[PDB]
Design a protein around this ligand. Sequence first.
Ligand SMILES: [Cl-]
Ligand SMILES: [Cl-]
Ligand SMILES: [K+]
Ligand SMILES: [Mg+2]
Ligand SMILES: [Mg+2]
Ligand SMILES: [Mg+2]
Ligand SMILES: [Mg+2]
Ligand SMILES: [Mg+2]
Ligand SMILES: [Mg+2]
Ligand SMILES: [Mg+2]
Ligand SMILES: [Mg+2]
Ligand SMILES: [Mg+2]
Ligand SMILES: [Mg+2]
Ligand SMILES: [Mg+2]
Ligand SMILES: [Mg+2]
Ligand SMILES: [Mg+2]
Ligand SMILES: [Mg+2]
Ligand SMILES: [Mg+2]
Ligand SMILES: [Mg+2]
Ligand SMILES: [Mg+2]
Ligand SMILES: [Mg+2]
Ligand SMILES: [Mg+2]
Ligand SMILES: [Mg+2]
Ligand SMILES: [Mg+2]
Ligand SMILES: [Mg+2]
Ligand code: NA
Ligand code: NA
Ligand code: NA
Ligand code: NA
Ligand code: NA
Ligand code: NA
Ligand code: NA
Ligand code: NA
Ligand code: NA
Ligand code: NA
Ligand code: NA
Ligand code: NA
Ligand code: NA
Ligand code: NA
Ligand code: NA
Ligand code: NA
Ligand code: NA
Ligand code: NA
Ligand code: NA
Ligand SMILES: [Sr+2]
Ligand SMILES: [Sr+2]
Ligand SMILES: [Sr+2]
Ligand SMILES: [Sr+2]
Ligand SMILES: [Sr+2]
Ligand SMILES: [Sr+2]
Ligand SMILES: [Sr+2]
Ligand SMILES: [Sr+2]
Ligand SMILES: [Sr+2]
Ligand SMILES: [Sr+2]
Ligand SMILES: [Sr+2]
Ligand SMILES: [Sr+2]
Ligand SMILES: [Sr+2]
Ligand SMILES: [Sr+2]
Ligand SMILES: [Sr+2]
Ligand SMILES: [Sr+2]
Ligand SMILES: [Sr+2]
Ligand SMILES: [Sr+2]
Ligand SMILES: [Sr+2]
Ligand SMILES: [Sr+2]
Ligand SMILES: [Sr+2]
Ligand SMILES: [Sr+2]
Ligand SMILES: [Sr+2]
Ligand SMILES: [Sr+2]
Ligand SMILES: [Sr+2]
Ligand SMILES: [Sr+2]
Ligand SMILES: [Sr+2]
Ligand SMILES: [Sr+2]
Ligand SMILES: [Sr+2]
Ligand SMILES: [Sr+2]
Ligand SMILES: [Sr+2]
Ligand SMILES: [Sr+2]
Ligand SMILES: [Sr+2]
Ligand SMILES: [Sr+2]
Lengths: 132, 53, 337
Amino acid sequence: MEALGADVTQGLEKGSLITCADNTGARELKVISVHGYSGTKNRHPKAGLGDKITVSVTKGTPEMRRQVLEAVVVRQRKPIRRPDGTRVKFEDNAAVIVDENEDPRGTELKGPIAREVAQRFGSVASAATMIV
Amino acid sequence: RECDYCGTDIEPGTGTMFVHKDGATTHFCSSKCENNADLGREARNLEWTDTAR
Amino acid sequence: PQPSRPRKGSLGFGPRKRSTSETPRFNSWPSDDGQPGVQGFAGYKAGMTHVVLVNDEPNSPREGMEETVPVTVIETPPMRAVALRAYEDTPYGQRPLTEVWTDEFHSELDRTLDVPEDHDPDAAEEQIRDAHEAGDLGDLRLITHTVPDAVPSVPKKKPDVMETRVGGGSVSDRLDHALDIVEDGGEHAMNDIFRAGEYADVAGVTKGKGTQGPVKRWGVQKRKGKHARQGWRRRIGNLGPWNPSRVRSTVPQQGQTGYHQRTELNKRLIDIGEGDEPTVDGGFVNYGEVDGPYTLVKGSVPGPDKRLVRFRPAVRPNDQPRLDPEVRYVSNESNQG
RNA sequence: CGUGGAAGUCUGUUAGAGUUGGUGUCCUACAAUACCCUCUCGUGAUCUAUGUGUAGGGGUGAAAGGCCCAUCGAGUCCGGCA
RNA sequence: GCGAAAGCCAAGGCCUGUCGGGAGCAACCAACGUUAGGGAAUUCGGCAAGUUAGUCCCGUACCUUCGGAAGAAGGGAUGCC
RNA sequence: GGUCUUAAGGUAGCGUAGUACCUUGCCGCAUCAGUAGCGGCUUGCAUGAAUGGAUUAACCAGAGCUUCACUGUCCCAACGUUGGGCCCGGUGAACUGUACAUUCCAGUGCGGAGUCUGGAGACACCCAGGGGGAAGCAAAGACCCUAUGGA
RNA sequence: CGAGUGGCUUGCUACCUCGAUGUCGGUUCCCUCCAUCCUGCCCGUGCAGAAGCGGGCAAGGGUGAGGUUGUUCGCCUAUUAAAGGAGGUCGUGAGCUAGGUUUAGACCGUCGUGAGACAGGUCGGCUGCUAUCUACUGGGUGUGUAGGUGUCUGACAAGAACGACCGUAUAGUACGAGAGGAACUACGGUUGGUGGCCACUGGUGUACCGGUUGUUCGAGAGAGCACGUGCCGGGUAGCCACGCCACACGGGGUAAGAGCUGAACGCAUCUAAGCUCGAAACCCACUUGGAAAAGAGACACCGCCGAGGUCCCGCGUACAAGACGCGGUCGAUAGACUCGGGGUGUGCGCGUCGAGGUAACGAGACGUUAAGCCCACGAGCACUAACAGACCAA
Ligand SMILES: [Cl-]
Ligand SMILES: [Cl-]
Ligand SMILES: [K+]
Ligand SMILES: [Mg+2]
Ligand SMILES: [Mg+2]
Ligand SMILES: [Mg+2]
Ligand SMILES: [Mg+2]
Ligand SMILES: [Mg+2]
Ligand SMILES: [Mg+2]
Ligand SMILES: [Mg+2]
Ligand SMILES: [Mg+2]
Ligand SMILES: [Mg+2]
Ligand SMILES: [Mg+2]
Ligand SMILES: [Mg+2]
Ligand SMILES: [Mg+2]
Ligand SMILES: [Mg+2]
Ligand SMILES: [Mg+2]
Ligand SMILES: [Mg+2]
Ligand SMILES: [Mg+2]
Ligand SMILES: [Mg+2]
Ligand SMILES: [Mg+2]
Ligand SMILES: [Mg+2]
Ligand SMILES: [Mg+2]
Ligand SMILES: [Mg+2]
Ligand SMILES: [Mg+2]
Ligand code: NA
Ligand code: NA
Ligand code: NA
Ligand code: NA
Ligand code: NA
Ligand code: NA
Ligand code: NA
Ligand code: NA
Ligand code: NA
Ligand code: NA
Ligand code: NA
Ligand code: NA
Ligand code: NA
Ligand code: NA
Ligand code: NA
Ligand code: NA
Ligand code: NA
Ligand code: NA
Ligand code: NA
Ligand SMILES: [Sr+2]
Ligand SMILES: [Sr+2]
Ligand SMILES: [Sr+2]
Ligand SMILES: [Sr+2]
Ligand SMILES: [Sr+2]
Ligand SMILES: [Sr+2]
Ligand SMILES: [Sr+2]
Ligand SMILES: [Sr+2]
Ligand SMILES: [Sr+2]
Ligand SMILES: [Sr+2]
Ligand SMILES: [Sr+2]
Ligand SMILES: [Sr+2]
Ligand SMILES: [Sr+2]
Ligand SMILES: [Sr+2]
Ligand SMILES: [Sr+2]
Ligand SMILES: [Sr+2]
Ligand SMILES: [Sr+2]
Ligand SMILES: [Sr+2]
Ligand SMILES: [Sr+2]
Ligand SMILES: [Sr+2]
Ligand SMILES: [Sr+2]
Ligand SMILES: [Sr+2]
Ligand SMILES: [Sr+2]
Ligand SMILES: [Sr+2]
Ligand SMILES: [Sr+2]
Ligand SMILES: [Sr+2]
Ligand SMILES: [Sr+2]
Ligand SMILES: [Sr+2]
Ligand SMILES: [Sr+2]
Ligand SMILES: [Sr+2]
Ligand SMILES: [Sr+2]
Ligand SMILES: [Sr+2]
Ligand SMILES: [Sr+2]
Ligand SMILES: [Sr+2]
């Protein structure tokens, strides 16, 4: 993938419960796998800011619940490092549901987004209200 | 830059930036300030802080 | 069928024992490409600070922008190249032939060496030249020492002696370049060999940690779950199978950790200077105040503060040299806090 | 609404009795059955001291072939016996 | 303090649950404290650990042999002067 | 099959059961995924009425499963605390010992060798360690068979 | 249908062990095999491209996480370059686990007149030992080579020190009617492994500072105890990972394969002699060890009545003993003091305010006061202590 322009300490694991920052009808998401990832023995597969993840819908509307869809990690509680040395962290851990062509499933994105996620997934950027 | 809590000049290549739920941004110079802020204490009421004095 | 996993720790830095010399010894030297010159320098580790730098790489999207880079401050005062050793090409490899010394010796050199009183620098020089005519001359290296007295933070006054190779053009021209350095007093600085922005190889004897268990020493697991509460916490499963009926040296066991020689490759020299510019407020923790000739090495450097580290022009660089980087800010903030 | 104060009733390391898990500690032990935490019962078919009765193919047994002095699908001692 | 509870302290008893000295005192072990982000992914199994907690107020479902369930759950309060 | 054995020929119920071999039975619930658990179906290898059947409030250090909460169980380990461990003074056992013994790789041999054969390696002594081997030490195998054994 | 290889499955035999070689699965840690799953290089195609299918060389590296089940196996999910198999007493209990198997208790079904049985199911159910030898990981003492200090050499030894993926340009290009859609090369990053380091982020921090509950010292001040910090808040140094830095290219020789020249065999022929190429594989390159390499090494200087070393003393860049490193008055080695740099967060006392209360009294607020208290770091500073002095030695 295209360089994030930041060093990330993966804050999520397979089985982690995160917030769905969009109007799709999905409220809570469960991390299943991380695109392009291959671990090591005993290691819980890790997910972080800017990673495209396969997800499960835990809480939401009946039509959206129990569905296995792709998503992009948009926010995380564990700090990330910007080239200017500064660390950046969020209030919660969040993701935006995405389709085959990396375009958001919803129309409106709830809460802020990292500038690095914007550089990578353009159609998610030009759908965001606040970019930090 | 200047710390959004205590008010001292943050050393470049140091510090953390907290991004709130609404989108607000709070730059911190140290862990001490992050901790005092999470305790519900306001900078103006703490005598050691630059904002207070 | 039980998952695969790479073995715990590398077998290339073995045996994991205590180093013979605290002074690092290079086992390889750079090629003979450019003009004649000494292929290395030495200094004393001070501590760490960060620096703000302007991106030099043309392939980087962030070219021209401000980047925060970690740096190790190393006090590098001028050394003295007291002699020139010559090697001959014998059927058993390279063997030392003779040495050409000096008259100008540093006052505190008699703390390590038995200082020469009666020497013949002309007859020894002739011996090296007859060996060059015979076509049996191997390589030319300089016996060199440091001046720890010039460093106030380092307690030792006993000079650290080491050999360094002279590489360059032809064997005839570098023989003469070597003799010129020696004859004066052997005084040379970091500037003479290195330029800021160049990739150097840093060798050092690591931080001593005494005897440590397999977990810290080889990076093996701790006992997990229920196995952690039975009386075994940080001990490996088994020392080997039933057959072979012996313990292999490849199985992760306890012993000496640290105080081993390491040669860290491709270390970018951010800045070479002289002054109190890289010093930390209140002094570098467990070292002191820097006010003299220094070097700013990008990233980490093996060994603790006060330890003698060595420099060598990169034998295997990956990137092309981007000379004299623009340093916009050097942190002087206290390392305490 | 009050009174009343029942209970093989409840909570309880009250005293006391017991002994679920840790398969912890110990395992040439402090100990030939111990140590710690955890846990159960604790006005009753309760617990306990002393005195007293039942004896070996016999006792005793809310029954596990449990227990009858570190000895039990037939105690222990000596003898039959070399 | 509800208390023959905890914790602290008298009266009284003791330093005899009877070998000591030294190393910032390493590995390893027994007991134990704290660990960012994640939160049972560990394991046969949440085993181990943790969480909750005293008291008052409000409020309390299915089922029920009408005794019970029930401290259900859930919510708020709590110091000093 | 539309009586025959041997008297009758399984009624209420419950049912893939702590009983169901086939079996991870089929359908459903739940999960990303559920040989689990629960519900329904159920021809039940070989359920079933005091050899008691069924149902069940309450009770339980009884067995299985699910959710919320919590957390070093785990990702993946770190630092610290106390007693040991290590060195010194004093005290002072035991287990074990055919002999020899610095081994390693192959081979051979009653087919599972530190000791035999061929090679390789190997200067002696000591300290600390975790336990690979001595088919390690501890117990005249509990299993199996045997004895014109015992109870 | 015929010929074999292996010793992973099962069966057969009864050679070895019954004065015992602990047993399924799992776990942890190490080595290996190749019949290759991925990665490298190749041949063929029912090879346009892309994607495949089949075959060859090849064991360097990798081959992961999860749901049911004790399960091995397997079924299933999502990731992946791929999620290969097998050997090592079905590797591994003087390592672990006890879920299964495998006693003594009990239930159900079946069988039995019955005691009881079951190659059925089910709940419960114990795991000893202080290492003599050997083996390896690390640490010392001696002897050999035959005075000392310093610097080296390199016989040999170890390594995976690197493996793999994504993206960008190439390029919407080659190719193809279209749909679709490459590569050489150059770049940016990710992942796994590896070694090191602490400026930064993070953890710890029973140093330290503060708040505060119970009780005791009459109150106050200031303290002890509440498990080895009563609890809560913050936290320096250090140690750390969740933090940061570093880990090629290129040569040489080959395999499969592509060829050149070329004869036996006037031609032909990549082979018979000769030669050019060509794998992540081999060698070198690179890192680590390494004068005990018995051919027991080399160089330079000092010295044989004196070079050097040991003890002693003050200490750590070192450290379980031993070892190692530095300093020792011609000195900043350690401590004291003073600064600096840091931690906490505003001291005791006094003044004013203070809901009230006749007054007594009064939780608390402000000021004095970036105060008080504290520091495992630095600097200054010979003030105290590195004194005295012994020994070995060609
Ligand atoms: Cl996954
Ligand atoms: Cl384990
Ligand atoms: K046997
Ligand atoms: Mg596993
Ligand atoms: Mg710091
Ligand atoms: Mg800071
Ligand atoms: Mg009696
Ligand atoms: Mg019985
Ligand atoms: Mg945690
Ligand atoms: Mg698992
Ligand atoms: Mg528990
Ligand atoms: Mg069913
Ligand atoms: Mg054995
Ligand atoms: Mg026998
Ligand atoms: Mg029997
Ligand atoms: Mg009989
Ligand atoms: Mg092959
Ligand atoms: Mg291999
Ligand atoms: Mg098997
Ligand atoms: Mg086995
Ligand atoms: Mg074993
Ligand atoms: Mg055992
Ligand atoms: Mg044992
Ligand atoms: Mg079970
Ligand atoms: Mg059982
Ligand atoms: Na144990
Ligand atoms: Na009444
Ligand atoms: Na108990
Ligand atoms: Na009898
Ligand atoms: Na009971
Ligand atoms: Na812990
Ligand atoms: Na004996
Ligand atoms: Na052993
Ligand atoms: Na019997
Ligand atoms: Na065969
Ligand atoms: Na066989
Ligand atoms: Na065996
Ligand atoms: Na096993
Ligand atoms: Na391979
Ligand atoms: Na499974
Ligand atoms: Na075994
Ligand atoms: Na086992
Ligand atoms: Na065992
Ligand atoms: Na090649
Ligand atoms: Sr050298
Ligand atoms: Sr070398
Ligand atoms: Sr155990
Ligand atoms: Sr063997
Ligand atoms: Sr009662
Ligand atoms: Sr048990
Ligand atoms: Sr004990
Ligand atoms: Sr016992
Ligand atoms: Sr416990
Ligand atoms: Sr009770
Ligand atoms: Sr007799
Ligand atoms: Sr008293
Ligand atoms: Sr005594
Ligand atoms: Sr703390
Ligand atoms: Sr679970
Ligand atoms: Sr409540
Ligand atoms: Sr019927
Ligand atoms: Sr019943
Ligand atoms: Sr031991
Ligand atoms: Sr082969
Ligand atoms: Sr392939
Ligand atoms: Sr699970
Ligand atoms: Sr099966
Ligand atoms: Sr195995
Ligand atoms: Sr069992
Ligand atoms: Sr039974
Ligand atoms: Sr059975
Ligand atoms: Sr000899
Ligand atoms: Sr492309
Ligand atoms: Sr298109
Ligand atoms: Sr205390
Ligand atoms: Sr509490
Ligand atoms: Sr060929
Ligand atoms: Sr020698």
